[PDB]
Design a protein around this ligand. Structure first.
Ligand SMILES: [Cl-]
Ligand SMILES: [Cl-]
Ligand SMILES: [Cl-]
Ligand SMILES: [Cl-]
Ligand SMILES: [Cl-]
Ligand code: NA
Ligand code: NA
Ligand code: NA
Ligand code: NA
Ligand code: NA
Ligand code: NA
Ligand code: NA
Ligand code: NA
Ligand code: NA
Ligand code: NA
Lengths: 252, 251
């Protein structure tokens, strides 16, 4: 086999306050979840510095987005340099909400991946297909196009060491469709085969491919057991006490 | 004029703990014109720290926000989060958000609605591009953008918490420099629009600020224009000359 460290990210999205953040982080920290699992929280920009100062170094802190240059005339945007200046080392890039609500292109995501890695951050690039794409038989076509753009952005092959991929079944998020652990495993296996052919066997065997569909305390252990599922990028559940149980998904 | 002069400095995507400390110490120590309202619009990651550092004499603004309090909008910041950082202002509809990030008139109106509902004060930005100005569409474009902002105002009293910024996008990064006369012409047209579409009371009280190229050399001549009630400054906001621009309405 290959032994990839399990990775659980909690994407708070546009949620949090000084008061609610303190309560969530105390619960997570006091619970001491599975020591063998890497744990990340992706928090709103306005709380990045305070969350990183409060939270023990065991836990990673990510920004939920960044732009593709260090500074300039981009009112409202945040750079990797500003994320590092807040003491944080991670960023989520190409999240389905950024792609499909805010219209971020594959090429823009590739340029953000390039700039973040150049500045020394670690990145969680997100991929995934919509319902119309899946129904038209374009799951691999869409995912491979998105992966091509991320690969083009990797400055040097060694930098894959700082990448965690998240697959989002957008076709299942906010449609009546539900993705099964079997459907998750099928896509993750296809992504790993893509990495083997287009990057290297060494990168394919070491890279964490995490699942960004609906993850609950009730389904997390069955997903974790799948051989090509190396963890999660959790949405709504990341704000809830069940995030601790999801962090323990790979424990036994 | 009985409209209080208003000078905003938009840092855009610029700042660090170190550079911010130097800029804010210089601004604070300079004690610029106490009769002028001064705002700094800073990157989200520094909002809380800038508001804690700066005396209440200064306003601190976010550079953007979204149109609901919470939800599944990875990367977005709400008015509730801006208030939670101790800040009371937000810039909305900046030319960069409209023309680089594709924010629609309708979205800007919804953001204005949500920010005002949550108790923030707002700086909605309007302005026409070069192709629009050359086609004689300056007023058509500005009035379309103002219609969408007005649709977002929850109740007429809420204009008390609005400062409009006119950005001559046609002049920003086309190499062209807009004259104080060209600024005054647009500001007068916007004030007449407010008189007809809102009220004479709002038209006479609302600050219409200029967001074109403002320098130490042109700021006093712009300030003296009867319908120019201050500035939304870009690059100069990071420089010592921002203090001179804050003093534009003196003498
Ligand atoms: Cl970190
Ligand atoms: Cl490669
Ligand atoms: Cl404030
Ligand atoms: Cl009104
Ligand atoms: Cl009237
Ligand atoms: Na790695
Ligand atoms: Na669903
Ligand atoms: Na493989
Ligand atoms: Na299941
Ligand atoms: Na697994
Ligand atoms: Na303060
Ligand atoms: Na009223
Ligand atoms: Na009023
Ligand atoms: Na210019
Ligand atoms: Na004036």
């Amino acid at each position: 086999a290959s032994n990839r460290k399990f990775f659980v990210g909690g994407n708070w999205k546009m949620n949090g306050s000084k008061e609610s953040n303190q309560k969530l982080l105390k619960t997570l920290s006091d619970a001491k979840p599975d020591a063998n699992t890497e744990i990340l929280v992706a928090v709103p920009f306005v709380y990045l510095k305070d969350v990183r100062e409060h939270l023990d170094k065991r836990f990673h802190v990510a920004a939920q987005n960044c732009y593709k240059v260090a500074s300039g005339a981009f009112t409202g945007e945040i750079s990797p340099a500003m994320i590092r200046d807040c003491g944080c080392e991670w960023v989520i890039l190409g999240h389905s909400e950024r792609r499909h609500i805010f219209g971020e292109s594959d090429e823009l995501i590739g340029e953000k991946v390039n700039h973040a890695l150049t500045c020394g951050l670690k990145v969680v690039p997100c991929i995934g297909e919509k319902l119309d794409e899946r129904e038209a038989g374009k799951t691999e076509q869409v995912c491979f196009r998105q992966l091509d753009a991320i690969k083009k952005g990797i400055p040097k092959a060694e930098d894959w060491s700082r990448v965690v991929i998240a697959y989002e079944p957008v076709w299942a998020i906010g449609t009546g469709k539900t993705a099964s652990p079997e459907q998750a495993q099928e896509v993750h296996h296809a992504v790993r085969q893509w990495l083997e052919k287009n990057v290297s066997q060494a990168v394919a065997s070491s890279l964490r491919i995490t699942y960004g569909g609906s993850v609950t305390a009730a389904n997390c252990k069955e997903l974790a057991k799948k051989p090509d599922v190396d963890g999660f990028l959790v949405g709504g559940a990341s704000l809830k006490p069940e995030f601790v149980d999801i962090c323990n998904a790979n424990r036994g």
